[PDB]
Design a protein around this motif. Structure first.
Motif, mmCIF file in Angstrom:
data_model
loop_
_atom_site.group_PDB
_atom_site.id
_atom_site.type_symbol
_atom_site.label_atom_id
_atom_site.label_comp_id
_atom_site.label_asym_id
_atom_site.label_seq_id
_atom_site.Cartn_x
_atom_site.Cartn_y
_atom_site.Cartn_z
ATOM 1 N N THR A 2 0.755 -1.318 0.076
ATOM 2 C CA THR A 2 0.138 0.034 -0.065
ATOM 3 C C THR A 2 0.751 1.485 0.016
ATOM 4 N N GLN A 15 10.136 2.603 1.427
ATOM 5 C CA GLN A 15 8.678 2.399 2.005
ATOM 6 C C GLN A 15 8.299 0.852 2.379
ATOM 7 N N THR A 19 8.790 -0.487 6.466
ATOM 8 C CA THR A 19 7.409 -0.327 7.349
ATOM 9 C C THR A 19 6.853 -1.872 7.535
ATOM 10 N N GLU A 20 6.972 -2.674 6.462
ATOM 11 C CA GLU A 20 6.866 -4.166 6.799
ATOM 12 C C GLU A 20 7.498 -4.475 7.961
ATOM 13 N N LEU F 52 8.818 5.302 10.057
ATOM 14 C CA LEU F 52 8.708 3.884 9.609
ATOM 15 C C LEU F 52 8.053 3.161 10.937
ATOM 16 N N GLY F 55 4.389 4.285 10.990
ATOM 17 C CA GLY F 55 3.284 4.266 9.921
ATOM 18 C C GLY F 55 3.627 5.463 9.102
ATOM 19 N N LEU F 56 3.943 5.153 7.769
ATOM 20 C CA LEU F 56 4.115 6.493 6.733
ATOM 21 C C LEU F 56 3.014 7.220 6.560
ATOM 22 N N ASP F 57 1.824 6.806 6.854
ATOM 23 C CA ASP F 57 0.646 7.523 6.467
ATOM 24 C C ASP F 57 0.210 8.810 7.519
ATOM 25 N N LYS F 58 0.911 8.652 8.735
ATOM 26 C CA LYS F 58 0.684 9.554 9.758
ATOM 27 C C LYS F 58 0.986 10.904 9.429
#
Lengths: 206, 143, 80, 67, 69, 142, 60, 145, 63
Positions: A2, A15, A19-20, F52, F55-58
């Motif tokens: 994602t 990415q 993050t995994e 990381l 969460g990259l989305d923050k």
RNA sequence: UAAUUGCGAUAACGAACGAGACCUUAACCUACUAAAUAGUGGUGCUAGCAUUUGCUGGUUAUCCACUUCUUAGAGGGACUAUCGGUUUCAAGCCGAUGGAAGUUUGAGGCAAUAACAGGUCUGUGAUGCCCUUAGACGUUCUGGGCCGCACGCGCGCUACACUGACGGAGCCAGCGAGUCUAACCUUGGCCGAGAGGUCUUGGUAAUCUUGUGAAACUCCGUCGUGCUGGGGAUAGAGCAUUGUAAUUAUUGCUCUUCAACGAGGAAUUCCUAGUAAGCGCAAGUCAUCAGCUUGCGUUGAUUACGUCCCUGCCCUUUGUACACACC
């Protein structure tokens, strides 16, 4: 995985592989076991991290040195002999390169190749300087699992250090050559040489 | 979508522009520039004989860009390294003034730089756009 | 005219160890003895409202080899 | 090592003797009590003292303290 | 001594050997052959023509190459 | 107008690094340049590290300006990785929700390499008799 | 912070023990906008030993 | 990528200026075997002589060897500034020189002879074998020879 | 090649005139029903596991 | 216990000096009072890339706001807290958790009693006595000397290289200093390979030098184990700089000569965390001259968390023919 986007790019090899799972530089900490009991709890390979460089603080309380990853404890023992003291950035760049050399030479996990080397080189028993009387003889005490990691790394760097001196090879090379001969005690390893020398002496004067 | 030189790798950027300059024919490579040492602290002349002057010039362009003004003095210390004084200890030693200066004057002729108020030079709109156009090239160099 | 000298008395000369220091000079300059002039100044300081007092005389008291007699009384602190 | 001096422990014994019901088992509250019933010249001492007064407290409420 | 110039016969070795070992560095070419080492660094840019060897880690201090594909 | 921004700092040794976190499009820039380019090199991921573990989305809804001064090449790095992770938890503190914030804290202190608590180490004074704070000149006796 | 470092010894005898004296100078400035009287008034009503006072007119 | 070979064109150990010069060492540092040329000078002479500095000494034709020796002895005629020269403003001729080969030991023997003849202080220091620049001699300079 | 593991129950004190050696008491890992006192070189705490060469020995005071 | 620090034992009870307290410095504070000599956000004015609003800058004050980073006042904060393991289940020690900080918080300043024939009469217009006082041992001036070199010892600097050297490019500190009846800290412009020259400028200084753009270091390449391009001693030639004055080279710069040193024998110093070690920088000196010291920050570890084996000091027991005290 994602792949989300934001005003400032951030690469794809960044990415995903991060993050995994929290890999090393990009090596996995999982599926790597200390293939020798009595040396676990100490050889720290269970808390993952990206680079072997941290604002540590392992010289306040006694045994706190153990919650330090052996990778960084390996790196830290690299930067020595006067002209090299304090140059950690150089050492991490040496070690990062040392793992790539290893991985190439024999598949596997290089971080496992290292951990293997530490376990097989820590002297089980050793010689102490007893009173002896005059020509002070010796006595054969055993060595702590903390020292088993301490003097190991100590040997595995003094090995690669004195190896790559006036020699055409690099530090990452003679360290990937000394880790490989210690991950399976080839006996052509300087460390394995010293180790099978201490146990030999500690067997002879007990 | 809008590229600054502040978005390019300083090694990549300066490598790029210092070739765009050499292949652009006109700058003004000084009469020496084949005998000089860049600093009295240095030991040997620059190894890239043919176009090291282009290297420095580009680096300065980038360097003035991300500032307000920087004169000959500030640049002489910026490029000054350590000086071996043989059997004595090392100290800091400033770099050649003629070099940095002749760079800053040859860069006016191509309108990359210009004398600014408050002293020193400053990147101009002509050059501001010039490094912002080659910023893309070395940022879009992904095939 | 841009600078003018004034003249106070003193904040009880039994607390200023400078006036007392000057007193010990004069007493000995007035032929008085070591232990007399010393005890005398000290007892004046004690009866002046002080917590303690120490008057030390160094030098050659009985000629030849020099010595050091310490005449102190009251309460003193030294360190911090 | 951290061995409290007599000047400290003396103040601790003295307060508790004549201020037990008011004193508690908590450092922070004790610390404030000392400023109301005792004149102390430095902050650290008062904190040093009030910390030891609470030390005796937490063991008084556990059996009588020796003296 | 070592070899700081290609003997053409020496160029036969490089094209037919390096694909044997799965690790090739500057010192590798110096140990096994007797290249100058100054001409090993150039030998590696060359050996990345169509990539007889493939890269994984290039760096000023260290060059880490592998076998072919 | 003036935007909902927040502001935290991060010090390592003599490196105080101010940060700003305003609601935006997710840019993350240090010293006028994107975080991708932080070129003390090997310690690259040291500044990626907070982006990381949480969460990259923050970050996509917030902007990050980080300006750095003092210290040295390594100390600035640890000073910026700290300014970043400290403004995120300070963004949820004020503009978002308590539950979310502690979720971010928990992601750090379970990994904490300084991250959001200052490393109190400083240099020790030299004293006369040697060159180091402890180190002593060589003596020769007889 | 003014600093003066000297050797404790007159002459050169003994272990090499140094000292270091300090003088601390504190500066601060207050801005005011007041007519004829309140100028010299404020300069002399608030005077004190040890404290140096100087007032600047304006501009250049 | 200079992965070129050359058959029997390479000729190691040649001869210039009556001195032996190895071929397997690079151009700039090869010449420096000559008494009178050093790193900066040998770096500069080869530039003016349009020699590709990447080569080894064993390369470079006798032609490319001639354009180097010629420049090297008449240096000032090829845009080589005088400060780069080891004997400027002589003392008995007033011209800028850059003596090479055997003539570095020669003009040294001469200069030392000159201010020994005229019995200058510095000369007497050169005679007695002592140190001639005002350094100390009490604690250092032992072992001799 | 027989090799015995041993886990610490308690640490006595420190012997050796210099203070190098530390006395300790261990279980026998595979057999809890044993308990032997050994001399150590490095720093040993509790719960860390020794690696006994000769699995009898059992020494005492040391200078 | 770091401590005559304390628990206690107690013919002692109660106390004072010292230690501790204290004071300074370095750590924490989105709580208070503030800031064109410290900052940031908005806003004008303006430049460039994209033009999709966006990204990066310029503007000594365009105007307005604020105090997160900086400064320093006033305070808060820790008391080894909380829990556990131990021990006279006392002082205390150990561990874990929390905390900016838990080693006397790190580091210092101060520091009793009594003593030494320690050093200083060459810091003193401090000084007793003697010496000497116009062929002066007074003062001043010219020149020389303190550095003289078969050699013994001490503190140091640079090194023996590839964990490097050289060439480019990356670029980050803190402690500091600085010009009146004067010429200091010097930006910027130009000139010069350099060192340096000249024309201006700002600063009596959180304002200007200065973001002291320091070095180690990061990167990219050249060299490739070869007393090698590692090393830079000895020496020749030339240009400048300080000064009345440089020879017995003051120092700097450029070319060339390119030594010993291949890890150092018996011995031996220093050191426990931002410590060692490596790195440079300001300050003292200073007309000029640092390989010296006093400080500062940058990078930043291996080992120990112990013992009395050695060298010392301390306490107690003990011997004494010592008391000018084991010279």
């Amino acid at each position: 995985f994602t792949p989300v986007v934001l005003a400032t790019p951030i690469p794809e090899e960044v990415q995903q592989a991060q993050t995994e799972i929290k890999l090393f530089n990009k090596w996995s900490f999982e599926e790597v076991e200390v293939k020798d009991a009595s040396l676990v709890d100490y050889v720290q390979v269970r808390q993952p991290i990206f680079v072997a460089h941290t604002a540590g603080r392992y010289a306040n309380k006694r045994f706190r040195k153990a919650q330090c990853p052996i990778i960084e404890r390996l790196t830290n023992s690299l930067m020595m002999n006067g002209r090299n003291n304090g140059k950690k950035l150089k050492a991490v760049r040496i070690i990062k390169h040392t793992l790539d050399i290893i991985n190439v030479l024999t598949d596997q996990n290089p971080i496992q190749v290292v951990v293997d080397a530490i376990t097989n080189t820590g002297p089980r028993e050793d010689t102490t300087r007893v009173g002896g009387g005059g020509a002070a003889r010796r006595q054969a005490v055993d060595v702590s699992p903390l020292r088993r990691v301490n003097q190991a790394i100590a040997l595995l760097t003094i090995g690669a250090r004195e190896a790559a001196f006036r020699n055409i090879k690099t530090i990452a090379e003679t360290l990937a050559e000394e880790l490989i001969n210690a991950a399976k005690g080839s006996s052509t390893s300087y460390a394995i040489k010293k180790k099978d020398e201490l146990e030999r002496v500690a067997k002879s004067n007990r | 979508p809008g590229v600054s030189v502040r978005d390019v790798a300083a090694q990549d950027f300066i490598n790029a522009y210092a070739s765009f300059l050499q292949r652009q024919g006109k700058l003004e490579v000084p009469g020496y520039v084949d005998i000089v040492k860049t600093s009295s602290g240095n030991e040997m002349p620059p190894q890239d004989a043919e176009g090291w002057f282009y290297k420095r010039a580009a680096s300065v362009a980038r360097h003035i860009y991300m500032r307000k003004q920087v004169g000959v003095g500030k640049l002489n210390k910026l490029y000054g390294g350590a000086k071996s004084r043989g059997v004595r200890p090392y100290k800091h030693i400033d770099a050649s003034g003629s070099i940095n200066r002749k760079v800053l004057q040859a860069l006016e002729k191509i309108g990359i730089v210009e004398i600014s108020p408050k002293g020193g030079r400053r990147i101009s709109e002509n050059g501001q756009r010039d490094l912002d156009r080659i910023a893309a090239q070395t940022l879009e160099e992904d095939e | 005219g841009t600078i003018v000298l004034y003249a106070e008395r003193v904040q009880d000369r039994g607390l200023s160890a400078v006036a007392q220091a000057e007193s010990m000079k004069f007493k000995l300059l007035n032929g008085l003895a070591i232990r007399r002039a010393a005890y005398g100044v000290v007892r004046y300081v004690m009866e002046s409202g002080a917590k303690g007092c120490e008057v030390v005389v160094s030098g050659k008291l009985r000629a030849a080899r020099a010595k050091a007699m310490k005449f102190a009384d009251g309460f003193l602190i030294h360190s911090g | 090592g951290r061995v409290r001096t007599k000047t400290v422990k003396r103040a601790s014994k003295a307060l508790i003797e004549r201020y037990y019901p008011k004193l508690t088992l908590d450092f922070q509250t004790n610390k404030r009590l000392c400023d109301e019933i005792a004149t102390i010249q430095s902050k650290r001492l008062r904190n040093k003292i009030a910390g030891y007064t609470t030390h005796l407290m937490k063991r008084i409420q556990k059996g009588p303290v020796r003296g | 001594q070592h070899a700081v110039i290609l003997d053409q016969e020496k160029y036969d070795r490089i094209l037919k050997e390096v694909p044997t070992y799965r690790y090739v560095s500057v010192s590798v070419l110096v140990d096994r052959l007797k290249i100058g080492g100054s001409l090993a660094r150039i030998a590696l840019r060359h050996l990345e023509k169509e990539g007889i060897i493939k890269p994984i880690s290039k760096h000023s201090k260290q060059a880490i190459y592998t076998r072919a594909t | 107008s003036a935007v909902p921004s927040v502001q935290t700092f991060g010090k390592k040794k003599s490196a105080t690094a101010v940060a700003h976190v305003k609601a935006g499009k997710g840019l993350i820039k240090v010293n006028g340049s994107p975080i991708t380019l932080v070129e003390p090199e090997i310690l690259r991921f040291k500044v990626y590290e907070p982006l990381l573990l949480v969460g990259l989305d923050k970050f996509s809804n917030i902007d990050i300006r980080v300006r750095v001064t003092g210290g040295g090449h390594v100390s600035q790095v640890y000073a910026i990785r700290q300014a970043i992770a400290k403004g995120l938890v300070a963004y949820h503190q004020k503009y978002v929700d308590e539950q979310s914030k502690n979720e971010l804290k928990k992601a750090f202190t379970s990994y904490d390499r300084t991250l959001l608590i200052a490393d109190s180490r400083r240099p020790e004074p030299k004293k006369f008799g040697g060159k180091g704070a402890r180190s002593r000149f060589q003596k020769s006796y007889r | 912070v003014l600093k003066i470092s000297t050797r404790k010894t007159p002459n050169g005898e003994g272990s090499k023990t140094w000292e270091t004296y300090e003088m601390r100078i504190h500066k601060r400035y207050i801005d005011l906008e007041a007519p004829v009287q309140i100028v010299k008034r404020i300069t002399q009503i608030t005077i004190e030993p040890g404290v140096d006072v100087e007032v600047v007119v304006a501009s250049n | 990528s200079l992965v070129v070979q050359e058959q029997g064109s390479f000729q190691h150990i040649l001869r210039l200026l009556n001195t032996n010069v190895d071929g397997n060492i690079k151009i700039v540092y090869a010449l420096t075997t000559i008494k009178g040329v050093g790193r900066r000078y040998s770096n500069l002479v080869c530039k003016k002589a349009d020699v590709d500095l990447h080569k080894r000494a064993g390369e470079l034709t006798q032609e490319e060897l001639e354009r180097i020796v010629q420049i090297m002895q008449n240096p000032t005629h090829y845009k080589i500034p005088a400060w780069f020269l080891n004997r400027q403003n002589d003392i008995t001729d007033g011209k800028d020189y850059h003596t090479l080969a055997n003539n570095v030991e020669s003009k040294l023997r001469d200069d030392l002879e000159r201010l020994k003849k005229i019995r200058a202080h510095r000369g007497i220091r050169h005679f007695w074998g002592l140190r001639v620049r005002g350094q100390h001699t009490k604690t250092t300079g032992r072992r001799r020879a | 090649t027989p090799v015995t593991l041993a886990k610490v129950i308690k640490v006595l004190g420190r012997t050796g005139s210099r203070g190098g050696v530390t006395q300790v008491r261990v279980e026998f890992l595979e057999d809890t029903s044993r308990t032997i006192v050994r001399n150590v070189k490095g720093p040993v705490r509790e719960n860390d596991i020794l690696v006994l060469m000769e699995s009898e020995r059992e020494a005492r005071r040391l200078r």
